[PDB]
Amino acid sequence: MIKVKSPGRVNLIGEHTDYTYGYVMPMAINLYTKIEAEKHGEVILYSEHFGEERKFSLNDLRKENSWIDYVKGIFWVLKESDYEVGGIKGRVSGNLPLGAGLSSSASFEVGILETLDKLYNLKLDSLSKVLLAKKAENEFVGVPCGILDQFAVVFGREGNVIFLDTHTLDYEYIPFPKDVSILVFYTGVRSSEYAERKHIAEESLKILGKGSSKEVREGELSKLPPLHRKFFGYIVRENARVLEVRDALKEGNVEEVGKILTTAHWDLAKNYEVSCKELDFFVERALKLGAYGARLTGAGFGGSAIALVDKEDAETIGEEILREYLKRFPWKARHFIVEPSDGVGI
Ligand SMILES: OC[C@H]1O[C@H](O)[C@H](O)[C@@H](O)[C@H]1O
Numbered sequence: 001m002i003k004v005k006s007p008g009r010v011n012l013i014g015e016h017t018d019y020t021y022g023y024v025m026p027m028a029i030n031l032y033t034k035i036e037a038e039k040h041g042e043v044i045l046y047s048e049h050f051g052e053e054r055k056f057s058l059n060d061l062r063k064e065n066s067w068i069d070y071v072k073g074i075f076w077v078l079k080e081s082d083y084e085v086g087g088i089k090g091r092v093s094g095n096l097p098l099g100a101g102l103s104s105s106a107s108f109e110v111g112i113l114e115t116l117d118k119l120y121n122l123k124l125d126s127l128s129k130v131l132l133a134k135k136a137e138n139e140f141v142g143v144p145c146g147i148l149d150q151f152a153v154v155f156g157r158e159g160n161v162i163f164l165d166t167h168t169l170d171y172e173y174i175p176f177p178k179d180v181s182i183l184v185f186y187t188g189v190r191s192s193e194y195a196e197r198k199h200i201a202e203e204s205l206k207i208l209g210k211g212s213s214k215e216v217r218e219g220e221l222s223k224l225p226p227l228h229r230k231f232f233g234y235i236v237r238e239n240a241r242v243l244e245v246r247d248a249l250k251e252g253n254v255e256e257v258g259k260i261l262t263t264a265h266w267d268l269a270k271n272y273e274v275s276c277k278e279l280d281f282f283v284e285r286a287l288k289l290g291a292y293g294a295r296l297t298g299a300g301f302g303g304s305a306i307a308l309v310d311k312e313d314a315e316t317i318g319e320e321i322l323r324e325y326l327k328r329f330p331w332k333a334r335h336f337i338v339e340p341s342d343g344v345g346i
Helices: 068-080 104-119 126-141 148-155 192-208 218-223 226-250 254-272 277-288 311-328
Strands: 002-013 023-040 043-047 052-056 087-093 160-165 171-175 180-186 293-296 304-310 334-338
Touching (some): 002 148, 002 226, 002 304, 023 043, 023 104, 023 148, 023 180, 023 334, 043 068, 068 126, 087 104, 104 148, 126 148, 171 226, 180 277, 192 226, 218 226, 254 277, 254 293, 277 293, 277 304, 304 311
Antiparallel strands (some): 002 023, 023 087, 023 160, 180 304
């Protein structure tokens, strides 16, 4: 029997940049999918979250349109890459909230991959784990996505964020300040919009004749159609913000990091049009209550937001905002205090 702990993730800055091969800056967080498993002739997994067992023969990688598909996708991608692995029997648990925008999918997929890696002695390198998990999500599960989530879940390092160039896959660890906490606020609001943004951005790159948004300047966007232009303007500003945050963090200037996050949030909300009143509420109140800055994290249109706050005030701020929020909105909102953590491991 082995135990794997696979973290979720938050993106600090660099939102809606990965699918144009821009810059991103995620961290793994200390909320986890836990998998405890042993070898078996078929695949049998009990999900604590769903309170149910689902199983399949190794012969059977047919999509079933349930959570088991995330498991099948890893078996599929391993088979497609010429690995021989056998079955597993085990239990999936942990404290990472499902569908909150903290990357339940990548956490789970990478966790299954790591379980198989260890049980079957596959000796996968870290980048292969990221690429296999991404390929499973994209091609088997059928969810478009960039590399952000998988990279964070694998490459996370305690006390550090990851600055990543998603075009080259060059990355560096940047220390995150002591006694600054990440307050995560899940709105209680659990894809077509994402696919549209991705499609428009990819088309814009072709119009511009460029392979990455890193290569694009404000000036060039006049060449794009009005809607392409609006959205791509955000992407260019966002890449610049990632580099600004990198410099500010390397100086320990959390006040500047916070300011940049806030600017980024309103850019997402007003120009990329991917926020909602629930996320905006959290951001505005967190700022009034003393956060250095705040921003939605992940795709938007629900999910979670983050606020950078003094460690000693994180609990009070989360509690005050949650009470206000629940008077205004019907959803089962939750807050968590997280820190930058190590990537997937036993
Ligand atoms: O930054 C937006 C973010 O949206 C989702 O979380 C995707 O899975 C990521 O790859 C990234 O595109």
